[PDB]
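=== Structure Prediction Worksheet ===
Name of assembly: unnamed complex
Input type: mixed (protein and possibly other molecules)
Chain count: five
Listed entries:
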Amino acid sequence: RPLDIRPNLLVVPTTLRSKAKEVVGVQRLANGADNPNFELVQVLDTAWLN
Amino acid sequence: RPLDIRPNLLVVPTTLRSKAKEVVGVQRLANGADNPNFELVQVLDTAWLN
Amino acid sequence: IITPALISALKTSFQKHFQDALATAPSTYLQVATVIPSTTASNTYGWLGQFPKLREWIGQRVIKDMAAQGYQITNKLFESTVGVKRTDIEDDNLGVYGPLMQEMGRAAGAHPDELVFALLKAGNANLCYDGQNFFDTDHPVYPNVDGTGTATTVSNLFAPAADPGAAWYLLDTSRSLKPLIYQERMKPSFTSMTKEDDEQVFMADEYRYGVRSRCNVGFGFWQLAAMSTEELNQVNFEKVYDAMRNQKADGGRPLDIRPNLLVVPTTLRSKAKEVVGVQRLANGADNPNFELVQVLDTAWLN
Amino acid sequence: PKLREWIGQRVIKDMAAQGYQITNKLFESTVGVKRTDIEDDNLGVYGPLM
Amino acid sequence: RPLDIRPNLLVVPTTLRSKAKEVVGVQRLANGADNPNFELVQVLDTAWLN
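=== Predicted Assembly ===
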C-alpha cells in the first residue's frame, strides 16, 4: 500500500550547487528545453557537507 | 560623426511573432545557452502586416 | 501683424523647449571622466602620476616636491547656430522648430561625451603630462623613488603582428580620479536675436539661434587606461587583465589596480557580449569572466 | 543639428529650400437601414453596427 | 583527536590566477567526467602578493 511520500528538499554539498541549479531552479535543461521539475524541491546548500 | 542611434522596438508579422518571441525575449535558448537579447527591444504585435 | 509680443512669446516657448531637452539629456561621460570646474584661463596638472601612500616614522617625514611642469589643458569653446528663413512665420508653420531645438539641446548635452571618447580613441596620437603617449609600449618607471638607475619597460598598448583588428579599451573607475578629466568653464547658454533692424535680418535672411559653451577634456594618469587592438578573445582578455594587475610603481610595490569596465566599438559589442557575459562557454560552462566588468556601449567609437 | 566647434567662424543651419508635399487626403464611409425594420421595432440592430 | 579543519578560501598571486581557475572552475575534462573540486573554495585574487 503506498505511503503517499512527498519528497520536499534535496541536500547537496556546496560543490554540487551548479548541478542542483541545472536540475532545479533554472528554466534551461541540458538539451535546452523547459524543465519538467522546475522549483519542484527547495535546495539547501551547506558547508557542513564539504 | 556617429549619431548614437538607439534601436528601440522590433515589429514582426503575425505569422512570425512566436518565432521572434522564442528567438528573442527568452533567456533560455533551444540548445540551453543564455540569450544576450532579453528585453533588449519592445516587440509590437500588429495584425495589419498579414 | 508682427509685434514684439509674438517675439517674446516665441522666446519663452523656445526657452521651455531647450530646458525640456536639457533635462532629459543623457549623461555618459561621467562614467569614465572627472569634472574639475575652473575659475581662470586654464589648469595646471603636474602632480599626476604621484601615488600617495603611507610611510613609517623611521626618521624625518618624507615630503614630495612635484615638478613645476603642468599639463596645460588650454580649454576651448563651442557653439551651434540655426536659422528660420523668416518665411514660414507668415505661413504660421510653427509646428517645426520644436523638434529642431530639442535635437540641438540633446546634441549639446551629448557633445562632452562625443569629444571625450573621440580623444580617447586617438590616445596613440596624443601625449600625456609626462611627455609620452597615453597608450605607449615604453612608459618610464624608475626603480627608485628619487628617480635614479636604469629604467624599466612597461607596456599598456598591445597590437597584433599583422591584420589589425578593432581597438578596445580597459579602464578603471574605482580610483578617485578617472583616467580622463573633462573641464567645464561655462555652462552652455542660448543666444537669440530677432530684431527687425539688426544684422542678418536685413542682410540675407536668417533669424539666428545660437547655443554657446566652453569646455575641454584632458588626460589623467595612464596607469589605469590601456589599449588592445588584437582580436577580442578569452585568452587575450585574460592576458591583458593579468598583465595589468601585475603592474608595480617605482620601488616594486604593487598598486592593487582594479580594472573596472571594458569599452568596445559598436561593431564588436555582440562579440564582446558572447565571449564574456554568457554562462555556457563554446563547449562547456562556467566562463571565468562573468560580470567581471561592466560593458559601456558607446557609438562614439564608430 | 549638433553642437559645433569654434574655428574662428560661424555655421548657420544647413538644410533649406525643400519640402515633402504630404498632400493630405480624405476618407469616408456610409451605411444603410433599409427602412423596413423600423416598423417591426427591431431596433436591437444598429447598436453594434455603429 | 583532530579538530574540524575546513579549508574555506584559497589565495594565489595574480600570475597563477589562470591556473587556479583551470584547476577549479571547469566541470568537464577531456575524458568527459565532472571535476569534484568545483566551487570547493572561494578564490580571492590579490595584487599585494606580487
